[PDB]
Amino acid sequence: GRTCPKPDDLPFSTVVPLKTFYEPGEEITYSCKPGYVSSEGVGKFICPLTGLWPINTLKCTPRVCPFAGILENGAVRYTTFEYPNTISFSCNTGFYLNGADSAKCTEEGKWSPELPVCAPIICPPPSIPTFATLRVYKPSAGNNSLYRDTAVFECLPQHAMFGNDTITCTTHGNWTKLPECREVKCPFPSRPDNGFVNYPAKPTLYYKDKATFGCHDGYSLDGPEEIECTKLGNWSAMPSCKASCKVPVKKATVVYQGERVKIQEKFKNGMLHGDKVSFFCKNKEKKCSYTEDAQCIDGTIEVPKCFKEHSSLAFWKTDASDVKPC
């Protein structure tokens, strides 16, 4: 036409002055938005006598921040690297991020905040507990320790450790929880009736001291032969001597453990405490046999009622340890 119209909207730029119509000869100026720099094309335009605006060669491109794609011992998500995009940071295993985790490209093309660096996780020398010693320790960095390094603790003699003995240098630079060495003592073990006890000749008995028990002839043990002084001050177990019992009835085949045995032959020297045997009893309902057990209890063994016993010489009847049924 003869009056030029509103200029074309150009991306990332602004036009001054901006009017719906211009007269021929009026001037408009394209200027890129902040953070965008002008490259190809020229901005200033003058209205021709014909209404048509000249073709626009101007191209505003975003300002480019310095390359930040390499983080030594780190990983960076970055995509574009130009205004106004942001980049993120991370570190590899054993490394902590020494600075801001995200940076942004400003209008001036300067990263803000400044770019971080990854630094190794370093752990201070471990502090030994009061009653403990350092069994092994290897400092990787100077006297300090790196990520996942270990120290193990050895308690002093006559002391008992509470808590795990291994400490790892963690991700946050602090050692894991430390064990405690305490001095614990154990009271003297009382001698068992009909038996003897042995311990070393010391005024006081401390941790892991062990006493050995015994019993005289005719008496067995119903506990562990060797007991130990545990971490809590009380002994591993208290054992006692329990009375062996006599063979209750001579001439009878009973069941000891898996197989069938004759009592008189199997326990010539008498039963021990807790030994379980089972007797055979006739049942006159269908003339079958069943099995009832009995066991020694500190010298007294109770024969089942159904055991009716007869002498072998009196072979008038059968020994009722016969038909398997029932």
Ligand X SMILES: *[C@@H]1O[C@H](CO)[C@@H](O)[C@H](O)[C@H]1NC(C)=O
Ligand Y SMILES: *[C@@H]1O[C@H](CO[C@@H]2O[C@@H](C)[C@@H](O)[C@@H](O)[C@@H]2O)[C@@H](O[C@@H]2O[C@H](CO)[C@@H](O)[C@H](O)[C@H]2NC(C)=O)[C@H](O)[C@H]1NC(C)=O
Ligand Z SMILES: *[C@@H]1O[C@H](CO[C@@H]2O[C@@H](C)[C@@H](O)[C@@H](O)[C@@H]2O)[C@@H](O[C@@H]2O[C@H](CO)[C@@H](O[C@H]3O[C@H](CO)[C@@H](O)[C@H](O)[C@@H]3O)[C@H](O)[C@H]2NC(C)=O)[C@H](O)[C@H]1NC(C)=O
CB of 176 to ligand X, least distance (A): 7
CB of 233 to ligand Y, least distance (A): 7
39, 50, 164, 257: which one binds ligand X (CB under 6 A): 164
The option from ligand X, ligand Y, ligand Z, none interacting with 200 (CB < 5 to 8 A, set by class) reads none
Our finding on whether 127 is near ligand Z (CB under 6 A) is no
Closest residue to ligand Z using C-beta atoms: 174
Rounded distance between C-alpha atoms, residue 24 and residue 47, angstroms: 5
DSSP 136-153: EE--SBTTBB-TT-EEEE
Our finding on whether 39 is near ligand Z (CB under 6 A) is no
In terms of residues, how long is the chain? 326
Residues within window 183-242 making contact with ligand Y, judged by CB under 6 A: 230, 232, 234, 237
Integer CA distances (angstroms), 151 to 120, 135, 139, in order: 19, 8, 9
CB of 149 to ligand X, least distance (A): 13
- Cβ closest to ligand Z, residue 15 vs residue 117: 117
Number of residues that bind ligand X (CB under 6 A): 4
- Cβ closest to ligand Y, residue 99 vs residue 224: 224
20, 143, 172, 317: which one binds ligand Z (CB under 6 A): 172
Rounded distance between C-alpha atoms, residue 63 and residue 84, angstroms: 8
Q: Are 277 and 263 in contact (CB under 8 A)?
A: yes
The H or E element that residue 263 is part of is helix 263-266
Residue 145 Cα to chain centre, angstroms? 22
Our finding on whether 166 is near ligand X (CB under 6 A) is yes
The option from ligand X, ligand Y, ligand Z, none interacting with 237 (CB < 5 to 8 A, set by class) reads ligand Y
Q: Are 219 and 194 in contact (CB under 8 A)?
A: yes
Strands 288-295 and 260-262: unpaired
Place of tokens 């209008």: 107
Q: Are 191 and 172 in contact (CB under 8 A)?
A: no
Using CB under 6 A, list all residues that contact ligand X: 142-143, 164, 166
Using CB under 6 A, list all residues that contact ligand Y: 230, 232, 234, 237
Using CB under 6 A, list all residues that contact ligand Z: 170, 172, 174, 176-177
